Write a protein that binds this ligand. Structure first.
Ligand code: CLA
Ligand code: CLA
Ligand code: CLA
Ligand code: CLA
Ligand code: CLA
Ligand code: CLA
Ligand code: CLA
Ligand SMILES: CC1=C(C#C/C(C)=C/C=C/C(C)=C/C=C/C=C(C)/C=C/C=C(\C)C#CC2=C(C)C[C@@H](O)CC2(C)C)C(C)(C)C[C@H](O)C1
Ligand SMILES: CC1=C(C#C/C(C)=C/C=C/C(C)=C/C=C/C=C(C)/C=C/C=C(\C)C#CC2=C(C)C[C@@H](O)CC2(C)C)C(C)(C)C[C@H](O)C1
Ligand SMILES: CC1=C(C#C/C(C)=C/C=C/C(C)=C/C=C/C=C(C)/C=C/C=C(\C)C#CC2=C(C)C[C@@H](O)CC2(C)C)C(C)(C)C[C@H](O)C1
Ligand SMILES: CC1=C(C#C/C(C)=C/C=C/C(C)=C/C=C/C=C(C)/C=C/C=C(C)/C=C/C2=C(C)CCCC2(C)C)C(C)(C)C[C@H](O)C1
Lengths: 90, 172, 175
């Protein structure tokens, strides 16, 4: 009804192709599909290892293993970005 | 290809004009983040580390009058704990934070592209008016800072293992 | 172009070099957000209070009335010792003076010249060439006073001995 504002740098992201344009990756638009795939596996293994090392949680958990455990969900987003980049030819 | 690493491709974001360019970015971190931000951060890390490495050696060589009572034996990281209890560390933090607030404004100007990164126009004694000497001095600053970053980590880890401190460990 | 005080940062647009006591020092750009005349009026008002206050703190330690509770050598401690009725009298007087000075005008209403209340019982500045140097003097001495009064008031909180006693008797040879 009036112009709806968006932050500067807003671009069009609507896609009907096989994979979205690399712009949907934000700052990761230039990273290669191999680099996301290797980061995906690396984050999955390190995150799973760190998660496993603190499954019986104590009052003294290792903070590096807590922080490293956040790599498991981050790896999901990494392999999605790897599929997007492989299907954009990157 | 890259001058540093022959097998890998040349990093796209990095250019020869920028000081301390070896074409070294195998993981391509320069693509992910704005290069101007990375340049400003690298220079800042270099200067803090340079002060840190010189200070680490200096504290072994000599200590300021009256400091010895407050710091009984602790060196490197250990001194910080005692001076944190006393007022030294807090007063340094306060004045550095005040400097950084203006540094935040400077960082914004560098990110916009208006101002060259890492330059605060601080040349109290003229050393870079030649415009040929300036570039050599800039390369010297980058290389010395990189060495000091590596050195600061190297020294502190030796303190962690033995507690000797940089010069004492070399003697024994 | 670029601020003289802060070399790296660009010059604030609002200043223009016109105002007295300007060296280009507005890194955080308060001037863009707020009216320059109101900002300067606040700066002068803050400084004038501080100049009087700093002289007062030193004088309160050095001199006392022949009365109890006005004999305290610590500025803050004396504020507690002195009767509330007197503090109320001053506060009411200051409020009446603000009403008197502005002819009942608020920030929008007040904006006249910046800080030029025009109270001149003795006109030191008869010459226009000599004046603007009295302007410059006032702003620089007031800024110094604001920092000094704060420095003194906190020293009174910490040492508790008053300004001159604290300065001469620095803690010496103890942790
Ligand atoms: C990252 C840097 C860093 C850090 C965190 C510390 C931290 C500390 N030092 Mg070390 N120190 C440093 C650098 C550093 N120092 C440097 C560069 C030197 C000279 C080579 C020293 C020499 C030194 C001695 C001799 C002693 C300490 C001591 C201490 C402790 C008490 C604070 C004090 O009195 O320092 C005082 C330190 C200084 C006055 C030196 C600062 C000099 C640098 C070059 C500042 C330069 C500012 C620059 C000119 C302005 C640039 C402006 C620009 C950014 C725009 C504290 C843990 C004391 C201690 O407990 O020792 C066991 C002590 O006795 N320092
Ligand atoms: C920030 C770190 C730091 C700390 C914690 C101290 C701590 C101390 N200094 Mg100080 N001092 C410092 C930095 C520092 N100094 C610096 C950077 C300088 C200038 C180089 C001095 C110059 C200085 C002098 C000149 C004296 C002290 C003295 C003293 C001690 C008085 C009590 C005593 O020894 O008995 C006290 C523990 C006194 C002392 O005993 O030293 C011999 C003294 O007379 N200091
Ligand atoms: C330019 C920086 C610099 C310098 C000159 C040194 C130099 C030194 N370090 Mg430090 N160090 C550095 C950076 C640096 N390190 C960094 C960035 C790290 C990672 C945090 C370390 C971690 C480190 C540890 C953990 C240890 C050293 C040790 C050593 C010494 C023996 C190195 C050796 O024989 O292994 C090289 C061996 C090879 C087989 C390489 C060929 C030597 C004095 C060792 C030592 O004896 O100190 C007590 C030691 O235990 N350093
Ligand atoms: C911001 C300024 C300021 C503030 C908030 C105070 C506040 C205070 N003063 Mg201080 N004082 C000041 C400035 C200030 N003074 C100045 C500038 C002087 C002269 C150098 C003095 C001299 C002074 C003395 C001698 C004493 C106090 C005392 C006191 C306290 C008790 C009130 C009292 O008995 O007043 C009494 C005040 C007087 C007897 C005379 C005050 C005359 C004024 C403040 C000086 C002239 C100001 C200026 C010309 C005003 C222009 C007005 C114009 C805008 C119309 C009170 C907390 C008393 C105290 O407890 O001492 C520890 C006390 O004995 N004051
Ligand atoms: C209308 C004008 C007027 C009047 C009638 C007074 C009257 C008084 N003032 Mg106020 N005063 C005035 C203007 C005035 N002042 C102005 C312009 C200022 C400067 C802003 C002050 C600042 C001032 C301070 C700072 C103090 C007084 C105090 C006093 C009292 C002193 C005598 C006493 O303790 O009670 C009468 C007692 C006796 C006769 C027994 C002896 C008295 C009630 C003092 C007081 O105790 O406040 C109540 C006090 O500390 N006055
Ligand atoms: C270092 C102190 C200092 C200086 C140089 C000035 C200078 C000035 N003041 Mg400011 N002023 C000061 C302290 C100072 N003031 C303080 C502490 C107060 C609080 C009472 C005031 C309150 C005040 C008012 C209320 C007004 C001035 C005004 C003036 C101006 C005209 C009269 C003149 O030449 O005075 C020279 C003064 C001295 C040499 C001090 C002795 C001049 C620019 C008038 C003006 O037109 O401002 C623009 C005006 O209305 N001043
Ligand atoms: C004109 C401004 C001024 C001046 C000359 C002073 C001067 C002083 N102050 Mg005050 N102070 C000021 C402004 C000022 N202060 C302001 C704006 C603040 C912020 C609220 C403070 C907060 C403050 C505190 C909290 C303390 C002092 C203390 C001191 C003394 C310590 C000496 C020193 O600075 O060593 C340091 C100097 C260097 C490192 C050189 C650089 C000294 C007499 C200390 C004191 O009185 O000792 C108990 C103290 O504890 N001051
Ligand atoms: C003049 C002035 C200026 C200025 C300035 C300043 C303050 C300039 C200072 C620059 C400095 C402080 C440079 C210091 C670099 C230190 C290095 C490279 C460390 C090497 C150590 C190594 C390799 C090691 C090691 C060790 C290991 C790890 C473990 C130990 O057990 C053993 C051992 C010790 C061997 C500027 C530019 C601001 C402007 C203007 O012009 C005015
Ligand atoms: C300009 C600039 C910026 C800045 C900045 C800075 C440094 C700003 C500093 C501002 C300061 C320090 C202001 C101080 C105000 C103090 C006052 C009004 C006290 C008055 C005294 C009173 C009320 C009293 C009294 C008393 C008396 C005398 C005696 C006692 O018995 C009783 C009592 C205790 C009641 C930044 C960097 C942010 C960026 C920006 O882009 C440009
Ligand atoms: C204008 C004009 C006239 C007028 C007038 C007037 C009222 C003029 C009065 C001007 C005054 C009172 C100026 C005083 C400023 C105070 C300063 C600069 C001190 C700063 C403190 C420092 C540096 C400090 C400190 C300290 C620290 C922090 C800690 C301490 O332990 C120790 C230590 C002491 C070292 C009138 C109205 C009559 C009419 C005329 O027609 C026009
Ligand atoms: C904790 C704590 C504190 C502290 C503290 C401090 C000062 C902590 C600082 C820690 C630092 C600076 C660690 C840096 C490590 C550098 C590394 C691992 C790089 C190695 C190089 C590599 C892997 C490869 C290099 C390479 C080679 C060999 C070949 C390839 C090329 C190249 C890249 C050159 C305090 C002060 C609060 C006290 C408190 O009581 C405790």
């Amino acid at each position: 009804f009036s112009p709806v504002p968006s932050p500067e740098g807003t671009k069009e992201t609507y896609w009907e192709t096989k994979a979205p344009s690399s712009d949907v990756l934000g700052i990761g638009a230039g990273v290669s599909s191999g680099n996301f795939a290797a980061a995906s596996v690396f984050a999955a293994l390190v995150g799973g290892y760190c998660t496993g090392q603190v499954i019986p949680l104590t009052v003294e958990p290792n903070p590096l293993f807590l922080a490293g455990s956040f790599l498991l969900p981050y790896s999901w987003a990494l392999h999605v970005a790897a599929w997007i980049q492989k299907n954009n030819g990157k | 290809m890259s001058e540093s690493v022959p097998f890998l491709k040349k990093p796209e974001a990095l250019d020869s004009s920028m000081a301390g360019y070896a074409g070294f970015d195998p993981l391509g971190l320069s693509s992910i983040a704005d290069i101007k931000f990375l340049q400003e951060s690298e220079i800042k890390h270099c200067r803090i580390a340079m002060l840190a490495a010189a200070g680490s050696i200096a504290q072994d060589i000599f200590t300021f009058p009256g400091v010895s009572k407050v710091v009984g034996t602790a060196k490197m990281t250990g001194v910080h704990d005692v001076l944190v209890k006393q007022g030294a560390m807090g007063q340094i933090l306060l004045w550095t934070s005040f400097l950084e607030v203006f540094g935040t404004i400077a960082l914004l100007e560098t990110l916009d592209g208006k101002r060259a990164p890492g330059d605060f126009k601080f040349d109290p004694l003229g050393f870079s008016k030649n415009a040929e000497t300036a570039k050599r001095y800039q390369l010297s600053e980058i290389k010395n800072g990189r060495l000091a970053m590596l050195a600061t980590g190297g020294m502190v880890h030796g303190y962690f293992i033995t507690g000797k401190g940089p010069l004492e460990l070399l003697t024994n | 172009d670029m601020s003289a005080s802060v070399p790296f940062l660009p010059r604030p647009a609002a200043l223009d070099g016109s105002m007295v006591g300007d060296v280009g020092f507005d890194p955080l750009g308060f001037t863009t957000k707020y009216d320059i005349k109101w900002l300067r009026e606040s700066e002068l008002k803050h400084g004038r209070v501080c100049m009087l206050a700093s002289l007062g703190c030193i004088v309160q330690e050095i001199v006392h009335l022949p009365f109890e509770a006005t004999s305290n050598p610590v500025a803050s401690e004396a504020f507690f010792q002195v009767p509330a009725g007197g503090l109320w009298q001053i506060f009411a007087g200051i409020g009446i003076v603000e009403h008197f000075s502005n002819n009942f005008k608020m920030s929008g209403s007040t904006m006249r010249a910046p800080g030029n209340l025009g109270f001149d019982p003795l006109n030191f500045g008869k010459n226009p060439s000599a004046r603007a140097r009295y302007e410059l003097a006032e702003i620089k001495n007031g800024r110094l006073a604001m920092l000094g009064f704060g420095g003194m008031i906190h020293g009174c909180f910490i040492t508790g001995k008053g300004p001159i006693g604290a300065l001469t008797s620095m803690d010496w040879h103890q942790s």
